[PDB]
Design a protein around this ligand. Structure first.
Ligand SMILES: [Zn+2]
Ligand SMILES: [Zn+2]
Ligand SMILES: [Zn+2]
Ligand SMILES: [Zn+2]
Lengths: 71, 74
DNA sequence: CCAGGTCACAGTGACCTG
DNA sequence: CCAGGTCACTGTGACCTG
């Protein structure tokens, strides 16, 4: 029992370099294909979790990189 | 004197006066859906998000909050 | 006018393919 | 096993209807 390094949902495998859910995986995936900068609605410290992850993409991506994800 | 109207909620161009405040089509539809039943809205931060035109799709909780704050009434 | 409907559209994530 | 694809679902907001 492994948990997403990004949001802590249950991981599905080791994706882009860390343990991660299908959600963070695909998100990260989408991200590297090109995207306008994201915007945090608050102060750049959101709580990324299983639910809240859909809300702050900016924080999600940041956390994506922080925990390691890379192509 | 006033050249334009702005959305009391998000500050984007207002389109009419909906739910009792000048509002954009976005905030109007948002509020509409929200009053149409139970809502599980969450804040990803501390319940003090900035709702503007770019951050509006981001926190539905705070958006609703301001909807009510500024006067919207069903 | 406005309220409430509608629907093309974009992000999402579970699941498939290779 | 995984990366990268797919696509059913869902929330949005621009528009329409009554
Ligand atoms: Zn995750
Ligand atoms: Zn954030
Ligand atoms: Zn608005
Ligand atoms: Zn919020």
């Amino acid at each position: 029992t492994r948990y997403c390094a990004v949001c802590n949902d249950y991981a599905s495998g080791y994706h882009y370099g860390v343990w991660s859910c299908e959600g963070c995986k695909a998100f990260f995936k989408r991200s590297i294909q090109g995207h306008n900068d994201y915007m945090c609605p608050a102060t750049n410290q959101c709580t990324i979790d299983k639910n809240r992850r859909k809300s702050c993409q900016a924080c999600r991506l940041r956390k994506c990189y922080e925990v390691g994800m890379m192509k």
